[PDB]
Enzyme design. Structure first.
Site, PDB file in Angstrom:
ATOM      1  N   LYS A  51       0.811  -1.215   0.000  1.00  0.00           N
ATOM      2  CA  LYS A  51       0.000   0.000   0.000  1.00  0.00           C
ATOM      3  C   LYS A  51       0.849   1.273   0.000  1.00  0.00           C
ATOM      4  O   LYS A  51       1.441   1.628   1.031  1.00  0.00           O
ATOM      5  CB  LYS A  51      -0.924   0.019   1.223  1.00  0.00           C
ATOM      6  N   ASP A  77      -3.062   4.695  -1.822  1.00  0.00           N
ATOM      7  CA  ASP A  77      -3.803   5.289  -0.711  1.00  0.00           C
ATOM      8  C   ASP A  77      -3.537   6.783  -0.630  1.00  0.00           C
ATOM      9  O   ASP A  77      -2.661   7.259   0.106  1.00  0.00           O
ATOM     10  CB  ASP A  77      -3.424   4.556   0.595  1.00  0.00           C
ATOM     11  N   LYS A 107      -6.431   8.846  -0.565  1.00  0.00           N
ATOM     12  CA  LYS A 107      -7.688   9.332   0.012  1.00  0.00           C
ATOM     13  C   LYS A 107      -8.175  10.634  -0.602  1.00  0.00           C
ATOM     14  O   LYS A 107      -8.328  11.649   0.099  1.00  0.00           O
ATOM     15  CB  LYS A 107      -7.546   9.543   1.520  1.00  0.00           C
ATOM     16  N   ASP A 125     -11.786  15.931  -2.806  1.00  0.00           N
ATOM     17  CA  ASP A 125     -11.824  17.198  -3.544  1.00  0.00           C
ATOM     18  C   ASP A 125     -13.213  17.472  -4.101  1.00  0.00           C
ATOM     19  O   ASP A 125     -14.209  16.866  -3.680  1.00  0.00           O
ATOM     20  CB  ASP A 125     -10.863  17.114  -4.732  1.00  0.00           C
ATOM     21  N   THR A 135      -8.999   5.681  11.551  1.00  0.00           N
ATOM     22  CA  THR A 135      -8.733   4.858  12.730  1.00  0.00           C
ATOM     23  C   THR A 135      -8.028   5.606  13.841  1.00  0.00           C
ATOM     24  O   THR A 135      -8.074   5.186  14.981  1.00  0.00           O
ATOM     25  CB  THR A 135      -7.857   3.656  12.409  1.00  0.00           C
ATOM     26  N   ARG A 139       3.586   0.008  10.884  1.00  0.00           N
ATOM     27  CA  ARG A 139       4.812  -0.077  11.658  1.00  0.00           C
ATOM     28  C   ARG A 139       5.145  -1.445  12.297  1.00  0.00           C
ATOM     29  O   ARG A 139       6.298  -1.903  12.244  1.00  0.00           O
ATOM     30  CB  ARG A 139       4.792   1.055  12.690  1.00  0.00           C
TER      31      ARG A 139
END
Ligand SMILES: O=c1cc(O)n([C@@H]2O[C@H](COP(=O)(O)O)[C@@H](O)[C@H]2O)c(=O)[nH]1
Ligand SMILES: O=c1cc(O)n([C@@H]2O[C@H](COP(=O)(O)O)[C@@H](O)[C@H]2O)c(=O)[nH]1
Lengths: 231, 231
Positions: free
Chosen positions: A33, A60, A62, A65, A120, A211
């Site tokens: 990703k 990704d 997002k 607009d 999240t 991570r």
């Protein structure tokens, strides 16, 4: 094609650093990703490299607009050939529908169109700073519903909603859950967390591990680990 | 350096097509704004080209992620050398503050950090599909306030708020307004519109003209026009 519901968030500030990890793994193991950080640094060029190696990329970015921009953006992604592309549900119905349509021209080669509901990294305490009285789970659901209606393929949320959703939306509406911390793992800005295990439990279609895998000595290892863990 | 409060939205699906227009104009005339569409297509490489020609670029990617991503993204932009960079206020205080901080390391070379409030392509009728009872102008203001508090340099909104804002936030809080249709100009998905004139009136610091200039035969001309128009 791979089988793991795992998409590893490649959030490195260095191309080599990242390409290192990539070579250690193989498609069959997971999907990659690319996001804001790495894209702002190496553009779609880097996406071609990851694809040259055979992996499925999830761009990704997002998009959030005006309808016109959204649709153009989505299609630029459809041109890159990416597997799945991002859009913000908070951007409205018009915008989403605009995006959907922008993809009809690519048909079967169209990437998966999914909308991010509530990030999240948020709790009702954060939504409060905005005129939001609702709550994470609540709100995310409204967005998810609107996303359903517009004809998008899936939504992005915390795995802590993958049940009420998978419930109210069916096995059809794909769910992608980030904020996956495997016990005794630093959370950070993350909030609505869950572990690979309990995630696979709620029914999430794919999960984003950032991570935990990348900020751990010998990450390649941690991936194989988390995989088996999910069996 | 230029003097026009004009930033032209370079939203072309072709590099040449765009570079054509660019060569016709000159920095002194306006600033350029690269966004989702064109960036997803040519990456930061294209931003270097526009900078090689001397213009000030406004990387309009409206980052809207988890605090960690935001900050990393912002800094990747600070690395590109861009003049101004985008972020979504709807992303929360934590996130914004995260972005701000990510820039301290660049100090005087840091791009301008501005947050998008409510997209100009929206009306209360659109915010309604979301659990929003407020209204464009209203809501945008709340976001703008939160943006102020976090220490960002400016905000992005419709020029139809550039007064109540410039009012409540002072000549300090920079305002950038898109959705600029110069009379007898197709609106499209645009809503909270205004003309270059009335825009400069409310006190907007910069304005984004997209199609009016790019979807008009001999655009270079239309730019010079709109400039004089604003004098
Ligand atoms: O709601 C969301 C949506 C995301 O895309 N993400 C993304 O998932 C990635 C991985 O985060 P982590 O390292 O904490 O697992 C980041 O690229 C982040 O922006 C998220 O954390 N929450
Ligand atoms: O609230 C906003 C924020 C924007 O960045 N924009 C951007 O301004 C640009 C120009 O739009 P137009 O061609 O309608 O003038 C587009 O890149 C768009 O995404 C906007 O229209 N409204």
């Amino acid at each position: 094609v791979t089988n793991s519901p795992v998409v590893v968030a490649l959030d490195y500030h260095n191309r080599d650093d990242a390409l290192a990890f990539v070579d250690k793994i193989d498609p069959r193991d997971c999907r990659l990703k690319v996001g804001k950080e790495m894209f702002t640094l190496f553009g779609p060029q880097f996406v071609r490299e990851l694809q040259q190696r055979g992996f499925d990329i999830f761009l990704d970015l997002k998009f959030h607009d005006i309808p016109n921009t959204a649709a153009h953006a989505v299609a630029a992604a459809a041109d890159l050939g990416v597997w799945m592309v991002n859009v913000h549900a908070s951007g409205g119905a018009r915008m989403m529908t605009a995006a959907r349509e922008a993809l009809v021209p690519f048909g079967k080669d169209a990437p998966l169109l999914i909308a991010v509901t509530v990030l999240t990294s948020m709790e009702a305490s954060d939504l409060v700073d905005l005129g939001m009285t609702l709550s994470p789970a609540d709100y995310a659901e409204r967005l998810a519903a609107l996303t359903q209606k517009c004809g998008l393929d899936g939504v992005v949320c915390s795995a802590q909603e993958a049940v009420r959703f998978k419930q109210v939306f069916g096995q059809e509406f794909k769910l992608v859950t980030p904020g996956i911390r495997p016990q005794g793992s630093e959370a950070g800005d993350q909030r609505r967390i869950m572990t690979p295990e309990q995630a696979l439990s709620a029914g999430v279609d794919y999960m984003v591990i950032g991570r935990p895998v990348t900020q751990s000595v010998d990450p390649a290892q941690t991936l194989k680990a988390i995989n088996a863990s999910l069996q």
